[PDB]
Subunit: 353 residues, 4 copies
C-alpha cells in the first residue's frame, strides 16, 4: 500500500538501520522546527475556480529559463549511499527520467565526474566551502563536466545540534566515503597543502565565507548560480544584488536551527522584492504543499526527504514511484482548483487560515 510519500517513509523506517533512519529523519534539538515546517502549510487553504476547462492540463515550466517536466527538483542531500547502494546515481537517474534536475551534494558518495559520466540529465552541483582552494577545484570540476547550475549552501556555518545522531553516536558507514574530497593531495609539505589538511581533517566549514566571498565565487562560475539557505527577503535581495541568478529559501529541512522560521513565511515577500527566481524547500510532502508555494510565487520546489524515502525503501524504482505519485498529486490538485496550466498559479487560489 504505497499511495503517498508517508507510506514510503513507513517502508523506509522498516528497512533502514535505526541509526541511518535517525540520520535521515532527525532534526535539530527538540525538532519543533521540522514539525513547524509541516504545520505552516495549514495556514493556507484552497479556493478552487469552478467551471474552468481542465480537460487539458500542463505541469511543464521554466526554471531559470530552462523548461522541465514540472516545477520540482531533487535537492542536494549528503550520504545518499548510506540509504541505498549508489544512492546518488539512483536519484539522478530517476530525476532525469522524470524530466527534472538533480543536485549533487558536495558531500556525496559518488564524485562529480563519475555521476556526470553515468548520467546525462540536467545536473546541478551544491557546494559547501571547507577550504577556499579546494572549493575552487570542485567548482571547476563541475564546470568542466557539464553541470549547468551551481548552488552555494550557506546555512551550515557550524553543524546543527542533532541529538538523534548524538544518542546513536552516528558514524559515517565504513564502506562509504566523501568521494568529492578523495584524492585531494596530502603530500605537499609547505603552507597550504597543510593548513588545507587542517580543513580536510576538520569536519567543519569556512564560517568566514561572506558577501565578499560570494563575489569571488560569482566570477569563478560562469553559468546559473543560486544561494541556498536564505530565510529573509532582505538576504535574498542582497544575493541578487551581488550577482546570484536566483535563491533557494530554506531552513535545511529543520536540521540546522530548530527555531528557524519556515521559508514559507518569507516566500511572497522574497518574490516581491527580488523580482528574480525564488525556489524553496523544507517540509514539502504533499502535492498541495507544492502548489501552495507555487501559487505564492515560488519558481520550483526542491525535494529533500520525500524522494529519499523512496530511495531508502525501494532504491531507484522507489524514487521513480515517489516522483510519479507527486506528479499525479500535483496534476490532480491543479485540476481540482481549476488552474489547468501550472504557470498560471497565483495567490488567487489561496485562503489565509
Amino acid at each position: 500500500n504505497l499511495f503517498n510519500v508517508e507510506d514510503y517513509r513507513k517502508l523506509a523506517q522498516k528497512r533502514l538501520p535505526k541509526m541511518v533512519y535517525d540520520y535521515l529523519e532527525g532534526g535539530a534539538e527538540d525538532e519543533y522546527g521540522v514539525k513547524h515546517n509541516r504545520d505552516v502549510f495549514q495556514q493556507w487553504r484552497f479556493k478552487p475556480k469552478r467551471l474552468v476547462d481542465v480537460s487539458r492540463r500542463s505541469l511543464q515550466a521554466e526554471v531559470l529559463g530552462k523548461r522541465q517536466s514540472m516545477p520540482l527538483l531533487i535537492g542536494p542531500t549528503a550520504l545518499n549511499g548510506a540509504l541505498w547502494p549508489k544512492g546518488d546515481l539512483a536519484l539522478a537517474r530517476a530525476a532525469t527520467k522524470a524530466g527534472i534536475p538533480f543536485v549533487l551534494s558536495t558531500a556525496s558518495n559518488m564524485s562529480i565526474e563519475d555521476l556526470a559520466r553515468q548520467c546525462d540529465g540536467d545536473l546541478w552541483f551544491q557546494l559547501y566551502v571547507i577550504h577556499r582552494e579546494i572549493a575552487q577545484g570542485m567548482v571547476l570540476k563541475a564546470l568542466h563536466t557539464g553541470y549547468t547550475t551551481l548552488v552555494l549552501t550557506t546555512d551550515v556555518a557550524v553543524n546543527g545540534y542533532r541529538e538523534r545522531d548524538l544518542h546513536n553516536r552516528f558514524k559515517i558507514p565504513p564502506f562509504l566515503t566523501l568521494k568529492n574530497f578523495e584524492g585531494i593531495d596530502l603530500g605537499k609539505m609547505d603552507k597550504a597543502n597543510l593548513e588545507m589538511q587542517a580543513a580536510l581533517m576538520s569536519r567543519q566549514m569556512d564560517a568566514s565565507f561572506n558577501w565578499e566571498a560570494l563575489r569571488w565565487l560569482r566570477d569563478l562560475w560562469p553559468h546559473k548560480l543560486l544561494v541556498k539557505g536564505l530565510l529573509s527577503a532582505e538576504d535574498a535581495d542582497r544575493c541578487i544584488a551581488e550577482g546570484a541568478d536566483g535563491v533557494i529559501l530554506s531552513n535545511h529541512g529543520g536540521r540546522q536551527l530548530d527555531c528557524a522560521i519556515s521559508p514559507m513565511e518569507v516566500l511572497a515577500q522574497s518574490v516581491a522584492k527580488t523580482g528574480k527566481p525564488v525556489l524553496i524547500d523544507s517540509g514539502f510532502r504533499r502535492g498541495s504543499d507544492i502548489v501552495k508555494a507555487l501559487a505564492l510565487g515560488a519558481e520550483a520546489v526542491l525535494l529533500g526527504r520525500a524522494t529519499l524515502y523512496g530511495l531508502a525503501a525501494r532504491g531507484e524504482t522507489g524514487v521513480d514511484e515517489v516522483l510519479t505519485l507527486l506528479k499525479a498529486d500535483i496534476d490532480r490538485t491543479l485540476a481540482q482548483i481549476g488552474c489547468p496550466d501550472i504557470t498560471s498559479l497565483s495567490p488567487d487560489y489561496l485562503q489565509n487560515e
Copy 2:
C-alpha cells in the same frame, strides 16, 4: 441509545462492512478537510436573546420560493444502495415524510423514472456530465418525470484521491449498478455512439464543462437550476450572472480536495454578493451547525453523511429518526437563542470566536 447523529454513525460502523463504511466516511488524502469542516463551526458561538416569547415556534421556510417544513434537504449521494437495500427510495420517502426535498444523484442505484414513480415528494436531480449527449438525455428524463429542480455538481472534474478506497481496493458491490446509465445504447457503429462508449467505459467526467456549457444547460432546463460545488463568492456571483437561480456552497464533504476551505468561510460574502439563494452543505451534524449557517444567510442546508448514517444503521426508519432528532434539535436551538421564527435568523445571534 440513539440521541444524536453521532450515535447513528457508531451504529452504522457496527453494521456496515468496513469497506463500505470507509467509502461512506472517508475523505481526501490526509482527511484534514473533513476535520476542518467540523472545526469551523466552533468559530461561532451564540448570543441568545432573552425574555422573547418562544412558546410558538416555526421552522417552516421557503426554499427557492417553495415552502417546506424546514430549511433542510437530503443532498445527492452516490451508491446509496450499498448502504441499505433500495437506499435511494428509503431516503426519498423519509425526506417526503419530513416535508423536505430529496436529491437523486446521477450515480444512484435507482433510476430517475423508477423513483419518481414510487415517490411523490419534491424530487430534485443532481447531474454529473460524463458525455454531453447522455447528459441531455437524463436532464430530459428528469424533466418529463416531474423533478422540480436540477443541480449541476462541478467539483468532480477528476476524482478525489481517497486513500481509504485505495487501501481497500474498493469496488462497487456486484449486485449494484449505475442504473441512470443502464440501457444507454451500445449498438451504433458510427461516430458518437462509440466515443460515447469511451465516456461510458470511462469512470471519468467531462473536465471541459465550463461557463459556456452552463449556458447550454440553462437553456435545456426550464425550471429551478442550482450549481453545486462552489467555494467562492466570485464563482457564486458568476453562476447567478449566467442564469442560475441559486447556488450550493460546498467542498463535497471533504472528499475532493483535502485543503479546500469550508464553504462556511465564504457563506456570508456569497450571500451579500449574489443577492440570491445560497444553500450549503459539508460538515453539518448538529442542529447548532445548521442554525449558524442559517443565521449567516444560508437559505437551507443539505445533509450528506448525517442522514446516510441513519440509512446504513436502520434503513428508512433510521433516516426518519435522524430527521426527527435534527428537527427537534433545530427547534430546541431556535428556542434557546430566542428566535421563535427560523426565518428571522440573522448574524445578530452569533459571536465570532
Copy 3:
C-alpha cells in the same frame, strides 16, 4: 488531600451514584460549552503590582448595597437533596456561616418557608415561571418569609438537551420532591385550577414569559430584583431599563445551549453599558477565575458546581471547606497581584492573552 475544588469533585464522583454524578457534572450535547466556560479564563493573565503593602487585606464588599464577607454567593441549583440529605439547608447554613447569601431554587427539595424558618442568613429566591398564577404565589411566600432578593432565571424556556441524563434515563430520586410545588391545590374543577394542573403535570416552563411579563413581576416584588441567564450587554441594559436592580450574566453552567458564549465574553461590555450591578457565574472553580471577573467589573460571582462538590463529598462541612479554600484562594491572589482591597480591582491587573 483536599486542597482545591477539583479535589472535591474527585471525592464527590467516588461517593455519588453515577446517575446523580452525571446529573450534576453533565452539560448540553457535546459539552463543548462547559469546556469553553473553563478555557475562557486563560484568555487573561495577571500583571501584579509590586512593592504594595498587602500586610492588611480586605475581601469585604457590597453586593447590591449590602455588605458581605466576600463577593461570592452560592447560586440556585435544583435537587440539592439528591446530592446530600437536606442539601438545601446544608448549603444555606455554610453560606450564612461564611457571611454570604444563598439562593434557593424554585425546584429545591426544601420549601421556601421551611428554609427561612431554619436559617437566618441572607436568603435569595430564584424563580422559574411554569404558571403565572403559581409564580405569584411563590414570590409572595418568599416575600412574607423574609427573602431579601428575587432572581428570575430566563435561560430555560425549554429544557437543555443533556445526553448524559438521556443515556442514564435520569429520574428524580423517589424520596425527593419539588417541595415548592407540593400542596398546590388540585381540587378546583373550573378554568385555571385545571389548566394549572396542565402546567403542574408539565415539566415545561412558560416559554412566553417576555419583557411585558418582567414588568408584571417588577411590580409584584418590592425589593431587589435580578434577571439571570443573560448573555449580552444589550439584554442586560434592557433589563435595567425595565426595572431590574442588576443582572446575572450566565449560560447556566453550560447546561442549556452547548454553543453559548461564556458570560465572561460580554462582562466588561455589560458593565460599561448598564452602569448597574453585573453579577456572573458559569465555569468558576479557582480564586483566580473569580478575581479576573471581579477585575473586569463583576459585582460578585455565584458558585454552582464548585460548592455542590463540597456538598456531595462531605455535606455541610464540605461546603464550609470549599468556601474556606476559595476565600483563602481569593485572599492569596489579591496579595499576589498587589491589590489588598478587593474593591480596588480593575482591568489594570489583567493581561489579554
Copy 4:
C-alpha cells in the same frame, strides 16, 4: 546521554527523593504558569542573517557595567543543600569557573560569610525581608564580606500555593537549616527581640514592604541594587525612579501565581521604558530561549531550575556540565543566526509567530 538540560532533569528525577524533586520542579496551583513560561518562547522564531563571517564569535558581555564570560547567572534558589550536599557552594564554584555571577538566597543552607570565605567569584546576595532589623543585618554582612550586588525579591509577599508540597506535606530536611538566620539572638526580653522572634518563628515575610521601604534599602546598600519579581514596564520604571540600578523581570519560575504573565511578555516594553539594565528569568531551558530574550533587549538571563538539575543529578560537576552545554548552545545559536558578537543581538533576528 546528557546533551541538554532536559536530560539532566530526567537524571535528577531518578536520583532525587520524590518529595525533593516535587519541591524543585513544582509550581503554583494547576501549574499552567510553568507550562506558559515554556510555551511563550514559541511566539518567536529566528530569521538568520546569511553570509556573515562568524568564524570568530564572542559571548562576553557587560552586566551592570562589569564584564563576564556570558550573559548568564545562576539565580537565587532556596534549600540547594537539599538537592546535593553543600549545594550552595557547588553552584557558586561552577558559576565562578564559568566566569559568571552567583546569587545566594536569603534562605540558603550556607551562610553569607562562609560562602564568601570559600569562594572568590562574583557573589550577589538576594534578600527577602521577614524583619526589617534582621534584614539590615544580612545586608551589612553581605556588604562587609564583599558581595558586589544586592537583589530584593518582591514576589513573595505571601507564599505561593504549591499543591505538590501540600500533598507531600513537604518539610525542610532535618539535617538542613536556614543558616543566614541561625545565631540571631533570642535572649532579649524587651520589645523587638520578641516581636522579632514573632517574625523568626513565622515562615511569613513582611508583606508591608513598599516603595518607601525600597528607599530605605537604597540608602543602606551603596553598590549595585536590583529589584526582582517585576512583571510590568511600569513597575520596572518606578524601581529605576526610586534608585534601582536595574531590574529582574520574573514570575519566580511559575511558583508564586499560576496565572501570572511570562516576563517575556513585557521585556521589550520594560527595556524601552526604563533605559536601564533589564535582566530576566523564568522558563529558560534552551540557548535559543536565552538568545530570544537577549535579542529583545535583556541584559542577561538568570538560570533557576536548569542549573539545579545539574546540581541534583551530578553535583558541582553537573552544574559545570550544564553551563558548558548552554554556553555551547548559545554560541552555536549565535553562529546559526549570523550574529557573531552577542552584544549585537537585536529584534532584527526575530520573527513574531
